[PDB]
């Protein structure tokens with residue numbers, strides 16, 4: 156029995172129309188063209204045998220507007236003339252002389268651990284695929300990015316408004332990925348330089364495991380639901396010792412509780428038991444806890460509620 | 462060590478520009494607008510009280526061009542005038558007075574069990590999400606579709622050409638989904654009416670399990686590799702006895718064998734052993750075989766090879 160859950164990304168067309176290629180001398184990567192601004196990772200400025208210890212302030216000083224070439228390859232091709240350049244945290248803001256005619260309604264936001272967003276993977280300014288990820292508690296994502304992908308963007312959508320939340324920067328030793336918010340900060344404690352980096356411990360996202368257990372009930376799978384309950388406060392003390400995030404309820408979770416008639420506290424107890432072992436049983440085809448679906452995923456994909 | 466594998470869909474913008482809403486009487490769903498043709502499921506023609514045993518030839522004869530209402534909602538909205546109608550298998554072909562100005566280069570193709578394709582899920586002619594699935598051996602997909610999703614489309618891409626392969630029609634009792642190819646045949650033995658239907662046994666897709674074991678080896682996870690080999694002929698006899706598809710090697714699998722230095726027959730042996738149990742161990746974070754990634758997925762996402 157299929158749960159009805161897939162990894163569901165937003166349609167990417169609106170964001171595709173904003174991707175460009177940014178070249179600075181010998182270096183190239185992707186950028187995001189919104190209004191008269193092109194955003195891209197600042198390490199496009201850095202020579203290859205220097206990424207280990209760059210001085211981004213000096214590199215920026217050494218650049219002129221003609222140092223940056225910006226090209227739109229898809230749709231109607233364009234070459235964009237740069238008329239200003241500036242740095243914000245780990246991003247460059249290049250000002251161009253033409254406003255993107257396809258600029259969507261947009262905002263910038265930061266995504267939080269456990270929340271899902273859509274990524275448009277791009278190479279040389281050309282979109283190549285789209286996928287969705289949850290931001291991990293250690294501020295990495297389990298993505299799919301190769302050489303040339305930097306500047307690929309992540310986003311959520313609220314109505315027609317695109318909320319850009321991620322610009323890809325790097326791959327860690329363990330194969331996971333991280334990047335910047337559009338305020339220029341790196342997610343977590345990461346730094347955009349070519350050095351091995353202390354990468355922190357991941358955790359199970361409790362609110363997402365609860366959502367997934369609700370998805371199981373909505374599919375008629377509820378062998379793990381007992382009358383026993385664990386309070387949110389007690390679960391959260393337990394979570395601290397057992398590699399779970401602390402549970403914070405939301406209206407989205409509340410709607411799942413009302414729909415199923417199963418209280419959050421019943422599922423907090425269930426998680427504590429399932430963490431010790433599934434004892435030969437399965438839930439939605441799995442023998443381990445699933446934390447990659449959000450409460451909003453379950454409400455949208457199974458009940459059609461946004 | 463995250464494998465670097467995600468469910469990767471194609472960028473959806475080219476297909477978004479082809480989706481329309483099709484309404485017939487009080488029935489509504491999605492259609493695909495290419496050149497002067499709108500494709501949609503023929504059951505839009507059926508009253509809801511009659512979906513169990515529709516007389517589609519008689520329904521078609523009763524329609525006029527004015528029976529159909531076609532709207533483009535996204536981008537530049539338009540109301541399309543139907544100027545001819547025809548039935549092909551389980552699809553309607555509506556001829557409209559306007560050629561879609563955003564028609565991409567396209568073909569129609571049929572997808573085979575084990576192959577992946579991208580789906581653009583739509584409601585009321587408006588794209589809402591994109592995801593990727595593999596066609597199962599029983600000609601269903603494990604999708605995410607609600608009421609109103611019919612006419613959502615699936616496709617692959619070669620270069621800039623979109624190969625349309627799927628139009629969504631129905632959800633089965635076990636939560637899986639099926640639909641039509643654009644020659645109007647249903648996938649599998651399914652029929653487009655509201656009657657509960659014999660849905661056949663699924664199988665593990667051996668070629669995809671082989672791909673996933675190669676992904677593990679590429680990631681440094683090769684504890685299951687031994688000198689022991691099972692020939693394709695011998696594996697295929699075993700596959701028929703153990704709910705696996707028969708293995709047919711491809712050039713894509715061959716390049717994984719070259720890159721890892723592990724022969725196909727070593728992994729066929731590994732699958733036989735792993736199927737009897739992982740013995741408490743994991744592969745790429747899993748305690749069961751994974752068959753939802755293709756050889757092409759592994760070549761593309763891990764080695765950057767289209």
Ligand SMILES: *[C@H](O)[C@H](C[C@@H]1CCNC1=O)NC(=O)[C@H](CC(C)C)NC(=O)OCC(C)(C)[S@](=O)c1ccccc1
Nearest residue numbers: 300301302303304305324325326327328347350351352
């Ligand atoms: C930009 O396109 C690129 C994206 C990477 C390339 C491989 N996959 C990706 O997602 N970013 C970088 O290569 C990045 C540039 C820095 C200046 C930000 N470096 C990077 O990701 O290097 C990996 C590290 C940071 C050295 S990580 O600590 C590591 C150590 C040892 C082995 C592997 C990885």
Ligand SMILES: *[C@H](O)[C@H](C[C@@H]1CCNC1=O)NC(=O)[C@H](CC(C)C)NC(=O)OCC(C)(C)[S@](=O)c1ccccc1
Nearest residue numbers: 606607608609610611630631632633634653654657658
């Ligand atoms: C078209 O929008 C719609 C899509 C469905 C609705 C729910 N999720 C979907 O994917 N298709 C239909 O409703 C379809 C119309 C027929 C004329 C093809 N019927 C449908 O999906 O019915 C399900 C059956 C055929 C009754 S299946 O045998 C079943 C039996 C028992 C429980 C559930 C499903």
